[PDB]
Amino acid sequence: RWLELGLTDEEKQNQLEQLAEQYDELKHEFEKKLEAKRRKITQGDDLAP
Amino acid sequence: MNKEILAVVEAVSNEKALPREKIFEALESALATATKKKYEQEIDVRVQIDRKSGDFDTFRRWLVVDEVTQPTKEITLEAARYEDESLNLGDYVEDQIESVTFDRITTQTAKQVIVQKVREAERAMVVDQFREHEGEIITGVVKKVNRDNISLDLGNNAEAVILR
Amino acid sequence: HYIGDLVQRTEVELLKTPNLGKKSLTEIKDVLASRGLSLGMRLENWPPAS
Amino acid sequence: MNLTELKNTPVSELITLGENMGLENLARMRKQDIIFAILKQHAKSGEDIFGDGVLEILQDGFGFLRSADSSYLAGPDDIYVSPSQIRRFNLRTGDTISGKIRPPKEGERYFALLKVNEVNFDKPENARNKILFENLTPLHANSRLRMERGNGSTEDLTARVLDLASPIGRGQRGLIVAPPKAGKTMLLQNIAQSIAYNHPDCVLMVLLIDERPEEVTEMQRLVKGEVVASTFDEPASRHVQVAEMVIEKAKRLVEHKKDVIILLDSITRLARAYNTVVPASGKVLTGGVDANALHRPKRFFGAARNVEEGGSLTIIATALIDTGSKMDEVIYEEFKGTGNMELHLSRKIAEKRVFPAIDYNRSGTRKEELLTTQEELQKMWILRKIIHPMGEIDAMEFLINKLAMTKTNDDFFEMMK
Amino acid sequence: MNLTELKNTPVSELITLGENMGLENLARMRKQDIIFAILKQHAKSGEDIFGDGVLEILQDGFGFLRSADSSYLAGPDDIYVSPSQIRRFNLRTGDTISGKIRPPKEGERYFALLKVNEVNFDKPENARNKILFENLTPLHANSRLRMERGNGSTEDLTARVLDLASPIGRGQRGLIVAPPKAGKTMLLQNIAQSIAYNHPDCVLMVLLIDERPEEVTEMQRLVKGEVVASTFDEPASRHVQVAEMVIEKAKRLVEHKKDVIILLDSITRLARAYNTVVPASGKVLTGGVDANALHRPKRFFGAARNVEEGGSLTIIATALIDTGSKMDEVIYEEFKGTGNMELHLSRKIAEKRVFPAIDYNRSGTRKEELLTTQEELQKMWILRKIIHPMGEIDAMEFLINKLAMTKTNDDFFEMMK
Amino acid sequence: GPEEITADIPNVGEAALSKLDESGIVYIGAEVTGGDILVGKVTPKGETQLTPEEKLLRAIFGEKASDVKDSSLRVPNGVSGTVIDVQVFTRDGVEKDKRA
Ligand SMILES: Nc1ncnc2c1ncn2[C@@H]1O[C@H](COP(=O)(O)OP(=O)(O)O)[C@@H](O)[C@H]1O
Ligand SMILES: Nc1ncnc2c1ncn2[C@@H]1O[C@H](COP(=O)(O)OP(=O)(O)O)[C@@H](O)[C@H]1O
Ligand code: BEF
Ligand code: BEF
Ligand SMILES: [Mg+2]
Ligand SMILES: [Mg+2]
């Protein structure tokens, strides 16, 4: 839970920011898929007039 | 859930005979009976619904005695070292929370306690308001006659009894 | 480890035992004494014969 | 670990302590939250705790231990006590309680006081045996509270003239009728320094209500006493709460036979807050002020008295007049004929660069003969006789010149002959 | 592509840029929508983006990056950030964040900040290590903020007399008690030009609330500073939102040890908005104003202080009096005894064509000796002594004549001898 | 008036209502042998615009809900079994019950 680290920035900062980008994108894609699934399973269904 | 209890406390018709305080304590007793029915043990507890602030909670009563039967309500006369009791008897705790108060059995026992206490409250109010008449002559219409006792309507939900 | 050794252990050692809160104490007082026995008793013949 | 010796430490010291205790960066949480986390960890290392705080009983019956630096507010650093302890040791509002405390549990949000070792600087056994403050028989002030410092500096005159205008004693009821732009804060600082130097035995209590924060931080580390204040960044609820609880603390201290003195600034803003906190009474007088809204402030003003058995409760409250406010006008009108000790300050002399701007003929003290011997009695009588025909500003400047000509009041009396 | 260097461009420039980028006729969509579409296409061409904006955390916990030109509003040009970044870099409201941003996705409606490279003009590593604004210890103003320009023009007098009436310093609390028809906008423009010329190091912040749009477009391109305003064409929600967020930005800047100065106009309309945005408290005083409705404005007014460690937060708020409004009457009554710096403007002199209409005896500054040496101290004391017996209009015109007779305050002091 | 799935079925024994939940649907894993109420379907027949106050009061004091017609569906006679699953579907806009 403490990904925040840095030393010898010239390459370490680049690799750590790339991994942070990947982590953010993965978490956001998972949250969006979760929200889509929830909205699909929670929306009402037409039954009859 | 607190919205439901607020609705049921505001929807009382005879708010005089049962104001908010005694209605909330009736609901406390009903939830205590519901919690008793929840666990197979027999432990008496209090609720303290927090009438005006928010939702309810539950506590756990000990009734400190030297017995051991039903240890949920058994604490020795000296178990006041840790957990901050500091007293000999009467020390209770908030240990149990998360009481379900909306299922079928809970609703049934709630309605039962509510009707029992509205009967008790109408009885108490009528006796407190027409007891000082002891020694005076008052009229009233009878409504049921039996071989052992008859009933009388005095008005404003007042019931008098006449024995043999 | 033995119930015959735990029955000779009143509550005074439970609330002082480390890592014992309110749920663990409730368990050790409910699922233990509901079998008919009591938490804290006075016996002498233990363990016969081991 | 005591709460005071940990909280009066600077914030940076708390940050370094928490960082040495192996914690997350403490620059995020507030001071109360920092103290809470520090105590949580310091108790996770064992360390049976020793805490203290002023007691407040809520509507439910339990008690909360508030701290002095937070001006008696609610925070995670508070200590909770069940009504069982209050029924056992016979506690009440305003009683400062100090004793052993333990870590909290899951579901609990505050610490628990196990056993009390001090109640208002007394044995917990004698805490249940104490005469009530209301059952006491008030009397007039007898012991003179001399305010003369003795160094004769440019500030000591501020108290010298005071002693030359209206004597003050233990349990006296004091009002300061001063318009704005007058330097009431300077008068309060001078009187606090005088009471801290001359009479360090009696506990000093200074209260600043509805005040700017600069004066709060100035008073909290300039005078020798427990300074509790309340700025205008909070609703009237906190104002009336701290007022009630400081007066309860003073009452408990007097019940413990202790001489307390409460400096209040200002009574007008406190009455304003008490008016806007109370629901309406049905009708309205001029200024938008309710009728019963002044019942609580008036009580607060009447709590001052000289106890015959022991102890005293002196009060000095500053009033705001000449502000063009209908509300303040009616508040001063109500509070005028209420106390026996009054000090009027002239705004015309105040903003004329003649300090301290005092009004001799308008100020005085009822039953002043009980607070001074015949010697100073006759001296002040001669002073009043010679100052009555004089004007306001000329008399004020002549008196301050003749006062600065010497060191103390005795040399002035001798030169007046 | 930065957001500021694209938005501060004229609208026609944005239209031609979008048309060169191969887009539909951009005269239909609004400025925010034009910026959104331009960024969408400029990112569709690759071009890893670099954005910036002031942070706002909602009730959910995520953050939105608002821009200064749109007066911190919600639009398609906003940048979204998840609470994960706020938990990592320890962000808070009012912190301006600048760094790399990416294109959005389907279902997403805002851009995402990938990594921050600047937080309040600081390293993102030190952004988590910063003392809170509330934990700071306020003090009085020490460094004098001189307002004298030095050219002696027909407008410089407006500041000269100011320096002759009430000294002003860093972290000072300022009120402008002026009826309408007085030219408060002219005073604000003069003080902004003075602070931009004399002290360009401290960031200038000017805020116009509930104002006509003409003054908004005048101030946004006349003074040298970041101008955020809010016209009356929006409900009180936007007013209180921009107030809270500009004060959060000022607090963050002070926490970063920066001297900020907030010019506000008017505090009366802002209090009106704060009153109509808050739900009722249960009861009502004269004027239809709620009790707790003034808690937030009062706090806003009390946020000004002189930090002992570093930085300062000066405020100058204009109040509306003499408008015949019960609400404004009670607002001014509440705000009168709140600050230590006040400037009263006389309407009778204002609409008498004698500018600037100032009131000498009514205006002043508490603890003014901490903002000036003994030299100007004695000079201002002599000035007050000579102006006190004089009237209002005659004294004002005599002072402005003797001021225009010279260039600066030193020549006036020398001719006064 | 529209139809409801409330559990307050009047003119019926409490033993029949004991199988239903707080909403009006039988629990998951309840045994039924004969015709028993497993859904609390009610249909109003008389006066409309039932006020919520008197609505909840009928469940406590006073009279019962007359406009019901006792249209609660039951299992046919002879067929038995244990209910294992429930599937509820609501119209767009209508508020769902707690079982949904
Ligand atoms: N005894 C005194 N000697 C010298 N100067 C004084 C004295 N009392 C007040 N002053 C001056 O008068 C000013 C009063 O300021 P302040 O305390 O804010 O007024 P108030 O508290 O009455 O509103 C101070 O700046 C101080 O320089
Ligand atoms: N100090 C000044 N010098 C010259 N003209 C002034 C000055 N103050 C005000 N005015 C004139 O008075 C008018 C006031 O306009 P405005 O700023 O809208 O009023 P206010 O801000 O006082 O409500 C301006 O048009 C300006 O020309
Ligand atoms: F101290 Be000032 F008179 F508000
Ligand atoms: F600026 Be004006 F007083 F509306
Ligand atoms: Mg003062
Ligand atoms: Mg203007």
UniProtKB/TrEMBL annotation, chain B:
Cell location: Cytoplasm
Domain of life (superkingdom): Bacteria
Family indicated by similarity: Belongs to the NusA family.
The protein's role, per its UniProt record: Participates in both transcription termination and antitermination.
Summary of subunit composition and partner proteins: Monomer. Binds directly to the core enzyme of the DNA-dependent RNA polymerase and to nascent RNA.
Protein name: Transcription termination/antitermination protein NusA
Residues of the full protein shown: 1 to 164 of 495
